[PDB]
Structures are given as structure tokens and as C-alpha cells.
Amino acid sequence: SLLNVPAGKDLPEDIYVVIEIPANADPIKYEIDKESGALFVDQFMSTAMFYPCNYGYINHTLSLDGDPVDVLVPTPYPLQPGSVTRCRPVGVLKMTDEAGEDAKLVAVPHSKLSKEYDHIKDVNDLPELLKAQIAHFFEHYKDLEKGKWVKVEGWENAEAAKAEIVASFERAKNK
Amino acid sequence: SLLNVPAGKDLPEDIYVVIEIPANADPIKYEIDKESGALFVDQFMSTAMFYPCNYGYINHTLSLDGDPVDVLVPTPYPLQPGSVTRCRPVGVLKMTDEAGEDAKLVAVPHSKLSKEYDHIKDVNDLPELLKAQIAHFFEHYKDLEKGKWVKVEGWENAEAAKAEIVASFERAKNK
Amino acid sequence: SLLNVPAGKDLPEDIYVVIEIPANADPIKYEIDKESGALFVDQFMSTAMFYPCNYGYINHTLSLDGDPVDVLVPTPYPLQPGSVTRCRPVGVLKMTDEAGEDAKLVAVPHSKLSKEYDHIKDVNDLPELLKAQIAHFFEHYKDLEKGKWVKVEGWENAEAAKAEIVASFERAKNK
Amino acid sequence: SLLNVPAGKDLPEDIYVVIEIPANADPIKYEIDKESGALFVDQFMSTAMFYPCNYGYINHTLSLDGDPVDVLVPTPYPLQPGSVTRCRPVGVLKMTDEAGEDAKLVAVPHSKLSKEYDHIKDVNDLPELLKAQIAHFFEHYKDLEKGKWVKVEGWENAEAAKAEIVASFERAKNK
Amino acid sequence: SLLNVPAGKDLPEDIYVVIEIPANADPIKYEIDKESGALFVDQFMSTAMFYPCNYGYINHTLSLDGDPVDVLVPTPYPLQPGSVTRCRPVGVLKMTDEAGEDAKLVAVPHSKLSKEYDHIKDVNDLPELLKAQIAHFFEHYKDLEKGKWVKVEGWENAEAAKAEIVASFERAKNK
Amino acid sequence: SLLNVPAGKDLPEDIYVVIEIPANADPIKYEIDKESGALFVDQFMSTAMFYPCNYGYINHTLSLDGDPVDVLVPTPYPLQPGSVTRCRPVGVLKMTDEAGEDAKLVAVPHSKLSKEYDHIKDVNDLPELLKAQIAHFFEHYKDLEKGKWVKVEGWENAEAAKAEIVASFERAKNK
Numbered sequence A, B, C, D, E, F: 001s002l003l004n005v006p007a008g009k010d011l012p013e014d015i016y017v018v019i020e021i022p023a024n025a026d027p028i029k030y031e032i033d034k035e036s037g038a039l040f041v042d043q044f045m046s047t048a049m050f051y052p053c054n055y056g057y058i059n060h061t062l063s064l065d066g067d068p069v070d071v072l073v074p075t076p077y078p079l080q081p082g083s084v085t086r087c088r089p090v091g092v093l094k095m096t097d098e099a100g101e102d103a104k105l106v107a108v109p110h111s112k113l114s115k116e117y118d119h120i121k122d123v124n125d126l127p128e129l130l131k132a133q134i135a136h137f138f139e140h141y142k143d144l145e146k147g148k149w150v151k152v153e154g155w156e157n158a159e160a161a162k163a164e165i166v167a168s169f170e171r172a173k174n175k
């Protein structure tokens, strides 16, 4: 099941991302249940917003929010919920929400799957519009959810994203 | 796998619904296979009709038709096949088909997932148009399937739906 | 062409709404060109937001922003861009943007098209979640567009919406 | 505008069909307004049914129901509302509704647009399942609309469809 | 999980097909991972082409390309990735790609699921346009993928398809 | 109607593109009818290919193929058929088909509509994958249409695209 997918072929540069929410999708937040491996509805979002990229996580990791570290994966067409994509990290949006520190990695499809994102080497290669739209999304999607909130710290580079991947794999390994 | 999802956190008022068929979908009836847990095509529907809400079942239950008890779940946007939603029962359409007694529960997203349906407390709070459209769907979707048929008994309240949930959980527990 | 559609059969209670943007749509703002009658792209929206209802205008009206008065029309399924729907006003979100006073009417499908919205008589009959989501949308969709902004005044009733319709028809008639 | 499209290059064998409702679409009945040429919502359908093929009419015709003669056009992918397709009639479903005699032509894409339907020469070449699904749709889609109803007479051949086209063109020419 | 689905109720005439890629879908090639059973992205296709039918495989088989034997399944509406459909083989496109011999079976929905394809008894009953479109797809979809290629041998009949099914089941049984 | 839209606010650098075919769409080629202004089906495509960008033309121009000059417009989300987008030319694919010389301009959304494509100044700024996919599409989409064919000459720069725009406007002005 999805519970058995590796974190990656060669962390932190070569990772697998389990997708929970497609790009260009309806405003439903899904989460994989750690017990059954099934996709559960987590929230019907109350704002008229949508996840700006495909969204999911790296298996066998843990952020301080108590869930696997989160990943945004840009693709040319939306991915299937519950599918897995091999990717390469290029940057990270550092942020906190009500559940704890809650970084959002950005990882692009690995070169073996497509040449499209090979030119994206680091965070400055991502489009400025996309990065601004992502930060705005996280800043506002919980605006009508009482007791839920976000504080964005800012964008950091690929080396920072890789360090976040390492830290989150260690946290899961260790407790 | 989906075979391992609970019936609910606190039956009969707090249930999990495994979705087989999204709302606003093409006329393909899917069913979860009790052996593999995979979604199988059950029928390519022969009438130009669509399931009026998301449609699925409560795990670890059994109706007299030999399958888990059926649930319709209204949502603001269609759910993913094979996903699970926490819900609260509000009413039931009593009916029989060629395979046996075959009630259709209506359960709304739980308050933890959305406040949208909190105002729906009982069957009279569901829109009359929706209830009529649901009964009409079940009355007619098998009209071109020889040997398949439906007899609708009528709509009953949340207490009746909860009793149906209890009865169907007991039937599975007991044989 | 669309340029010739009436404001309504019997303003202000019985109106026609020309739709520019469907519900559940991609973040592209279209506007009907007053010269050709064709749908033009007005903006590729920069936030990850979507219009919360179908969106358009009443022909042969003018708001202080220099465009026909705006309307949000809730429907069970999204409408086609460039199509016209007969509706009945039920409320209005008073607001201003950088182009001028810019109220957003809410009008529901007329009883001749559906009985679904007959129960919505006035602004308090609209769902609270929908009204909050609409105000939040207008407050934020221009957050990444420099020099574009919104100030929301608040929700008002059906009588206020009808007065806005009358005022906007007079403004177009008179200049 | 659409009001100016010919009935056909060479009636009754070579016709143009103006599409109002796509195949595989949501349950919204649209109609072209004879005054403005714009697509208006005619009804939000109350049954959970969908038009089984693309649906529209032949311009410059009139059925006894007071509207242009109706056409169902099978295609490999749904057509755009308000678009026009060159077609060839292959059969007709004779029927009446509350507004008068109201035949439903079936016409396939002309050979110049595709070779796919060249093999469909007459009504017996249409799939039996499709013909049954079409009749069932018309029999039932108005089942929850008070005062609206259908009586189906039955399927007739291409020669009957051509005669219906001629008769309906004459009715419009003459009054 | 999907890893446990039978090859079929009664091979080679009565098979199960696990779907990886829907019909009418975006140009993303998915593959089920033999370890986890999860759907992985295999390639973001570089040509502007789409799989002409639903596409997947028969479990517990092996082609010379090292993967389960491939199947195209025509349906009236696209199937869900990861779903299973009971089918009947009607023909096969013999071909090789860079990974080895790589036949493409065509199997239609079994009569128990629909009567629609009962009339398709053998390869000559498939539409000529569909067969040509399928061969063209395989000939060209890898045209921009360096080192990936296809050589089509040609279409063969249902008996040939059944022999391919038997051979591929034996190959998996034996190594 | 669309027949009245300008070629552009300031040709050749500031143009309007009338869209016939959305990006990410089904394989139906539409064309605006020069008589009625309505969208007609031109072909049901026989290959399993899709237009790689939104596709349309500049009004009041003529290529040697006898139709207005063609334009591909990349956007973040597909455009509506029959809608108009203000754009800026960045390159051109020189090619011929059976009807005559038939260049394909590439023009991006104007800066007034979005900042997304401001960085695309010239043809080398377009992604190599996109340019290769476009050429491959035109090379192959007519492969199953007898008597229809394409010969691609190759990609040229923004200055070449502007010259093509000027030439095509003159051809329409002059005959």
C-alpha cells in the first residue's frame, strides 16, 4: 500500500512524493490515513481557493506538525490522488501553522520522468508568480477556519529544502 | 487498505463512508471488492442517469442484499472514488431491489470536516428536490437492465437511519 | 447578440444575467466587450482563487466603476460563459474597488427555471458560509495585482439589491 | 450570428445542426433565443438525467411545439454549446410533449467532418442500446416537472427523418 | 491490494484488466508498482498525444518487455485509474518497443457489465478508425523520447489475442 | 460579433487572438465561419492528438491557405472557444499544408492581462519541449486524413513573426 512507499531512491536529492490533492482541483483537502493507507477527507475548505500545485508528502518523514513533510509538485497536468511521483527538491517555503512548524517543500518531476523541469535548479528558477501565489495560498486558505492559522517565514533555497528533508526523515526514524 | 477502515468513530451517529461513485459523475457503477479491496466496475449503466450524490457504503456492515449498507453523501464538490469521509446520518430512503432489502442512507459531512451541513439535523431539512431526485434515480436507473428492479417504500428520519446502521453492523458482526 | 439582451422582463424583481465566468472554474476573469459583444480575457488571476458562484452582469446597467452592475448567481451546476439566466435578486454585497463603487448582487434562478431557490427570499436565507466565502473572495483575489484593491462595506437585503438594480439601470439610461 | 446559419447545404440529406446542449453534460437545458441569438437557460432539470447525445436544432425550421426541429448528434467527444455541425439524418424518434408534436431527429457527423459514422446509413445501424437510452431519457426527464410530459410513438427510418426535416422547413417558411 | 487481483475468472476468454491510464486523459503514463501496489508516474509524455482507450494490464502475466501484458479497453466513459474491469479479448496489436516484444491486447467490457460490446466478436468488428488511431498512437507517442521507439507488426484476431494471454500467464508462472 | 474584432490595438506587437480550440481539449478542430461568425466543426481529428496550446487566429488577416493567420497562445489554464485574448508575438513556426503556406504564430498573453509571460521576449525563451511538441503535432495530426499533409520549415524569431503578421494583414486588406 502507500504506507510502504520509500521516502526516496536517494534522499534528499531523489525523493518520492505521495500526492493527496491534485493541481487545478476542487477545494477538498485529503490526507492519507496512517492506519489504513486510504485517502480520507480532512476538510472541505471554506475559502474559494485551490492548492496551487499538486500537494502531498514524503513517506517515512515527520514535521513538527505531527504529519509527514509536505511537498508541492508542479506538473504540466494534474496528478491522481494517491499516486506517487519521483521528484527532486528545488526550494522550500518556511512557515508554521496552528499544529506546528510546517514547511512546504517544492520538488519538481525527476529528469527520468520528464526533461521539462531540468532547468529548475534552485529556488530562484521557480517563477516569481508561482512562489507568490503559493505563499498567498497558505497565508489565506484557513482565513474562515476558526483557530487555524498560518505564519509564513519565507522562501529558501534547494540546500535548505534538502536539509528539511533530512531533518524530517530523522524525526520519523527517531520517534 | 479500505477493507480495514472502521464503520465509524462512534456508530451510529459518527460514521465513515467509503465512496465508490462520485457525485456529478459518468454513469459507471463501481464496487469495492471484498477480497482485494480494489474498485471494480460493477455495471456500465444503460440509462442516461447519474448518481445524485456521492455514493458508497459503511464498512463492516451488511444489508439484506448481501452488500454493506449504502450511503449517499451530499458535498459541495465531488469526492474521489475510494476515499473515505466522516459523516453523520440524517435520513434514509427505504427500498428493496432484486437482491433484497436495500436502504439508502443519507449522511452529511461531519462538523469537523465542514460547518456547511450542520443545519441539516433531520430528513425534513434535506431539500425536497434532492429527496425527490434521489427516489426517482433509484426507481429508474435499472429500467433497461432485465431482471433488475427497485421498489421504493419512502423516506424516513434520522432515528430510522441510525436504527438501520445499527441493524446492518449487527448483521455483519453476526454472519 | 448579447448586446441586445434586456436588463429583465420586469426589473428589479425579474432580471436577466449575462454570465462571464462559470462557477467552479479556472482563475480567468472574462468580460463581454461592449463593442463587439465577444468575451475577452480581462485578467489571468494571480491568486489561487476562483469565483464562488457564476459571475456576470445585468445588461443596460452601469455601476460607478464604469461597467454594468455585477451579479453572482448560485446554480446546481456551472453555467456556460456567454449564456443568459433569468433570476431574482435576494441580496447584495456592498463594496468598492479601485475603479469605483462596485456592488455585487446575488440573484438566484427564477422559479420558472427551477424550484430549487424559491425558498431563498432574502439575504438571511443565503448560507452564511457562502456569504463569507464571497466576501473573502472579493477581499483577496486582487492581493497580488498592484494598484488593484477592494473595500467591502457589507451584506444588505433584497430591497437594497433591488434599489441597486434600479439605480444602475437609471445610470445607463442617463449617461 | 447563429440566427443566420442555413438549415443546410442541401436539405434534407445535408444539414447544419446548432448545438444547445453537449453530450456528457450537466443537467441544464439551454435554448437559443430567437431574438438575440444568445444561449438562455431554459430549465435546471429536476431529474438526475443527462442528454444522451449532443442536442440542438436545425435553423429555419419549426415543429408543432413551436420551436425549431430537434436533433441528437452522436460524436466521439462532446460539442461546444452554440457551435454548428454539418450532419446527415439517419433516423427519428417520433414523440409528443406538452407543447406539441416534437420529433427528435438523429443525425450523424457528415463524411466531410469524419469517416466515423459513414457506416450508419439508416436507423437500424444505430446501436440498440443508444436508441433505447434516448427513448428512456425523453420518457422520464420531465417526471418531476408538473404539467410537463412526453408520449413516445417510436423509432422511424432515415426516409421518415428526411420527411420530418422537409415538413419542418416548410412550416417555418410558411408561418 | 491490486497486487492480489486474479488474471481472470476463466483465462483467456474471461479476464480482469487493471487500469493505469483512463481514456480521454491527460498525457501522463502511470504504472502500478509491483512492490507497493501504488500507481507511480512513469513518464510525462513529450508528444501531444493521448492513450486512445483506457490502458492497463492483466495481473499475473509477463510480456517480454518485462511488465504484465498490456490491454486497451474501450468504454463509453473513462475508467478510474487503479480500478479493475472484467473483459473479453477481441484482438491484438502485435508490436515491439525498446524494452522488448510488447503486444497490445484489445479487450471489451464483459457482457455481465454491459451489452454494449457483445456485438464485437473479433478484430474485424472493431472500428477501422479506432484500430488505425491505436496503431498511430503507439507508432508516434515516443517520437520525442530519445532511445525509446516502437515497431508495429500489425493487427491480429481474437484467437491470436487469447494465445498471447496464455503465453503471458505462463511466462509469469514460470519466471 | 467576432467578425468585428480588431486585428489588434497596435499591430504587429499588440494583437487580438480569436480562440477556436482550447488548450488541453478534445480532438475537435473548430473554425469560425466568416459568414455567420459562429463556431463550426471543421474536423473530428482522426489521430489521438490534441492542440498543444490554445489555437485560433488574428481577425482581418489572410494566410496563403485562404484563412486568417493562425496563432498558438500558451496560457496557465485553457481559454473558452470564441473568446478573444490580447497577446504579443514571440515566434513563428514556418510551415505549409495542403491548402498553402500556413505559418503558426506563437503569441503570449499581453502584460496587461498577466505578468506571467513578460519574460518570454523571443523564440529562444519558449521552452524547447513546447516548441518540439508543437512541431510534432503539426507534422502528425493529419497522418490519417487522406490528401492532407504538412511540411514544417522551422522555428523563427519574434521579428519574423511580426513580419508574418504585417504580411497577413496586408493580404486581407488587399484581396
Ligand SMILES: [Cl-]
Pocket (backbone or CB within 6 Å): A005, A006, A007, A008, A060
Ligand atoms: Cl524509506
Ligand SMILES: [Cl-]
Pocket (backbone or CB within 6 Å): A097, A102, A138
Ligand atoms: Cl498548511
Ligand SMILES: [Cl-]
Pocket (backbone or CB within 6 Å): A087, A088, A109, A110, A111, A112
Ligand atoms: Cl532529477
Ligand SMILES: [Cl-]
Pocket (backbone or CB within 6 Å): A131, A132, A133, A135, A155
Ligand atoms: Cl513569495
Ligand SMILES: [Cl-]
Pocket (backbone or CB within 6 Å): B005, B006, B007, B008, B060
Ligand atoms: Cl468497525
Ligand SMILES: [Cl-]
Pocket (backbone or CB within 6 Å): B097, B102, B138
Ligand atoms: Cl440499488
Ligand SMILES: [Cl-]
Pocket (backbone or CB within 6 Å): B087, B088, B109, B110, B111, B112
Ligand atoms: Cl457532526
Ligand SMILES: [Cl-]
Pocket (backbone or CB within 6 Å): B131, B132, B133, B135, B155
Ligand atoms: Cl421523495
Ligand SMILES: [Cl-]
Pocket (backbone or CB within 6 Å): C005, C006, C007, C008, C060
Ligand atoms: Cl432593457
Ligand SMILES: [Cl-]
Pocket (backbone or CB within 6 Å): C097, C102, C138
Ligand atoms: Cl471586483
Ligand SMILES: [Cl-]
Pocket (backbone or CB within 6 Å): C087, C088, C109, C110, C111, C112
Ligand atoms: Cl422568481
Ligand SMILES: [Cl-]
Pocket (backbone or CB within 6 Å): C131, C132, C133, C135, C155
Ligand atoms: Cl460575510
Ligand SMILES: [Cl-]
Pocket (backbone or CB within 6 Å): D005, D006, D007, D008, D060
Ligand atoms: Cl436556410
Ligand SMILES: [Cl-]
Pocket (backbone or CB within 6 Å): D097, D102, D138
Ligand atoms: Cl422534449
Ligand SMILES: [Cl-]
Pocket (backbone or CB within 6 Å): D087, D088, D109, D110, D111, D112
Ligand atoms: Cl454524409
Ligand SMILES: [Cl-]
Pocket (backbone or CB within 6 Å): D131, D132, D133, D135, D155
Ligand atoms: Cl427504443
